[model samples]
Target: RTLLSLGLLVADFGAMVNNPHLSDVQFQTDSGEVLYAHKFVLYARCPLLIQYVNNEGFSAVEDGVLTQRVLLGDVSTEAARTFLHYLYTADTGLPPGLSSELSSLAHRFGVSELVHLCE
Candidate 1:
């Protein structure tokens, strides 16, 4: 019973993955993979993304829902998606052979938890 509420919140946010209807942030990588996410969640967990959203992000309407699209230069689609997942769920769940690269990305994005997990 202890912490069940918090755990449920985590699960709820994790369920948001790939849900475009509620997402307000988007990541566009050079690999042509676009990932959808929620702005409020990222703003609370990832600091670097907040700065990028204000600095270089562009606003557009997707199916009438406002979204901010941020370009992720040179970051692999797999790594970016994994990073976003961690921000929402706090789980590693790294794909095979992606820990090192994901660690670097986590470090660059100032996500200390993921960075520590990778180390």
Candidate 2:
């Protein structure tokens, strides 16, 4: 047996969810719900999302603020939620059936660890 605990280091990604700290990016879900997140964390984690955010693809521009939006028209709310969690924690926390779903999502997003985790 071993004793080990890794605190939220360098960045508090756990608190990132629903955080109110000057979010530089926004994710708009298919249900018209909007979620906010920081740019650096996203940039560091998912280059694909960064590409979309950096591009003009399906982005939202409200009141002249670029806001760096990425519209996910087909992504389920669960997929959206899980990807971020996986990004920060590297754990999908999904069971078999859901794991299969997450496995596909991981492939789509190129998150290899999640793909293996889901497997």
Candidate 3:
């Protein structure tokens, strides 16, 4: 087995992030920034997010296509995006000194890999 193949597979998942056509959920941050997402990805990567999606209240109705919106409070848009990048890509891509902020967010979201990365 080659590691490059695994890398490519993960890259494909990373590219699925915020894909409007494929994403079924919307995460709205305090700053009014929205990150389109997939429920399957969130459930697969972060189990805690499953609870977040429980409400799944209808948010947008366009052409009979309904989408769910989940609100994220108390975190900056940058921190939220960084957390999502880790969820989708398994890589931080975090700038120096930003890990401190992201670590707390990851902790709250129960993403231990990112929490350890932040450490």
Candidate 4:
């Protein structure tokens, strides 16, 4: 788990794929395409942290807002958490070009829970 977590923290998609233990695991996108091994591994690991990041304790919003966003197709929980992680951890602060894009994408996908948390 430590290696896996590190791979995730560093966004090392290639290293994650090369791990022999991941050979049999499979992943599918929202559109149902089969993900490559490395992408699958990265995606699988992200959600574990995403769930924690998206929840109330991480950001003082009501749980219902998160559920509603998903139900309404506003923002994907995955994308929102990814954005949030960057928001809190990125060294240069939010990149100007990407911030609005992420915000719009999250809003379009129903992730208002994150918008509330971020603000």
By lDDT, the best candidate is: 1
Q: Once model 1 is optimally superposed onto the true structure by TM-score, how far is the C-alpha of residue 1 displaced, in angstroms?
A: 1.4
Cα deviation in Å at residue 61, candidate 3? Answer: 1.7
lDDT of 1 by residue, 1-119 (tens): 75899889889988887567677888899987789888787889888878878789998886676788989887788888888888888876678577887888787778887777787
Least accurate 10 contiguous residues by lDDT in model 1: 92-101
What lDDT would candidate 3 get against the real structure?
0.78
RMSD of each: 1.9, 3.4, 1.9, 12.4
Model 3, 42-116: lDDT tens digits are 888887875676664457876799888888878777777777777888875677567887988778768887878
Question: What are the clash counts of all predictions, listed in order?
Answer: 0, 0, 0, 7
Q: Each model's TM-score, in the order given?
A: 0.85, 0.74, 0.85, 0.25
Residue 13 displacement (Å), model 4: 7.3
User: Model 2, 88-108: lDDT tens per residue?
Assistant: 655545656467666666786
- Clashing pairs in model 4, backbone N/Cα/C closer than 3 A: 73-109, 74-109, 74-110, 74-111, 75-109, 75-110, 75-111
Location of the lowest summed lDDT over 10 successive residues in candidate 2: 1-10
After superposing candidate 4, which stretches have Cα over 4 Å from the reference?
A: 1-92, 117-119
TM-score of 3: 0.85
Return the lDDT, model 4, position 95. 45
